[PDB]
């Protein structure tokens, strides 16, 4: 009735993407760990747009929808924030949100290209992952474009512009001995990235005794956060929201009682 | 109409592969060369880029409302 | 015009009980634990959780309506057992899983960067 | 007590019409001593069976053996009253039919015992003696082992 040990073993660590395997745990614990990987990572990204010019093709509502889709460098921060409706402060305050602003107008001939880098944020710390460059809008001579962005705190169950990750790779038994998946016709599926068996067989034998476990991973981050700096926010988040849990729990458990 | 942030699927950042695909093809790559040139491996992300129509260029041909 | 706030799936409003906990009248030693604003993220590893007690005679959770936000797990157990207390174990089994798990991580990557 | 029927069976089909199911098959088999005719079906992947191959069926009313009614509920934490655990493979199920060859006025010679094991049916025809034991729509425990 106690908790199992797990192990990680880490294969690929890079800048974009942790390739790990996690064993000797619940399919559960793992499937909750990539669902926070998706909803429950904090992350920075803009939430709040005004505009002060826009004399762009592409209407204020969808410069907005893009400008809230371009990743913010919140590696260290995103903890130290707070979520807006968590702050004393009223509308927007340093402690909860990163201010953006951009302005751009085409004098030249030449199409202007409204990128990333034209957004100018009043920390060094939060960048729209710019160390090519996100397209926020193209400007014909004479079009401008101005306005002023507050970058929020959230995570990805209110909105996909907080998902810190592209796609997550998730998969477990490999060469399939637990069944999960019956194949009308074993032999022409392709064989995973993982499996380690010889190319004559086509799937491991089943395991009536066998049950899910070293579960595969592939976190791809999309820049916001780093993919390590993804699984452990993951992991504190999950940690926290059972924590919070037990505490309410405990509560309710001391006042019916 | 204009190149989209955030692949619908996963959510790879895919706004600012779209120049770059363009210099790609315009110079020696096929399509399909392109897109792993720019790292874009998930067909999701690849449709993304492969399917891209650029209106906004067509609305770059007609006169801003203000001069 | 009917969009319900995106906010609407984790935040809880006021008066609104984090956990629940009402008997089940069926079965003896069985009760029912109603989570708000909690999904299948939480609701999954509790249950699984649960099954590893040899006390625990039943272990299941399911969300009513995917449109609402509240999740039911049914908990029942052996005599001389409550299932809050069954509750109470699964949770701070599954925090401690989670910090060996994330202290072994960092462990990892402190080994895989120059190491 | 508390046992229906116990007798030593040999497998001599696995699926003489086909392979119905991917998981169960349909075991065909014939019994020593008794000489009972025997149709089972077996879960295979999880309990592997081959053609020819000796085990002891054990059909009782309930699995302590000590003569106490099971009340037909699951509870893992029942090894208190020491259940028969000799055998390999248990079924649970429910006796639907007991079909015989009486006419009439002649009382039936040989029976024909139906049970239901949660969907995978078994068929026991032997001489009425021995399966006087089954009374329809009660709950019968399938006990078998292999034999060496
Ligand atoms: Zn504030
Ligand atoms: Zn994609």
Redesign the pocket.
Known sequence: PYANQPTVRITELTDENVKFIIENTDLAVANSIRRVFIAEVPIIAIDWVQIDANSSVLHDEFIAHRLGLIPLISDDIVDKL?Y?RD???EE??????VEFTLDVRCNEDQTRHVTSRDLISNSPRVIPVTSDDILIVKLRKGQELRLRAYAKKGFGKEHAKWNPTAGVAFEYDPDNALRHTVYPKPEEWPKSEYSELDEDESQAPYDPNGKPERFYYNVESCGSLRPETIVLSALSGLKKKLSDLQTQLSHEIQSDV | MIIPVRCFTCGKIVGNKWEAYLGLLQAEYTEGDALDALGLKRYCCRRMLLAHVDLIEKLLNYAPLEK | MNAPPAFESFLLFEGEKKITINKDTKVPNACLFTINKEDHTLGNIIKSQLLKDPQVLFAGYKVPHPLEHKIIIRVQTTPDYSPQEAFTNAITDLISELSLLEERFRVAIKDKQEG | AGILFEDIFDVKDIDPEGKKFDRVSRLHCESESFKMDLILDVNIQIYPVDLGDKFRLVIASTLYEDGTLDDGEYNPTDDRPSRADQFEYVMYGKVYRIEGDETSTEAATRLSAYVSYGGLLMRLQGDANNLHGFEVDSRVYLLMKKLA
Do not use: A
């Not at chain 1, 927007?92 to 949100?97: A, D, L």
């Open positions: 707070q807006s702050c004393t402060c927007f305050c340093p402690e909860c949100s």
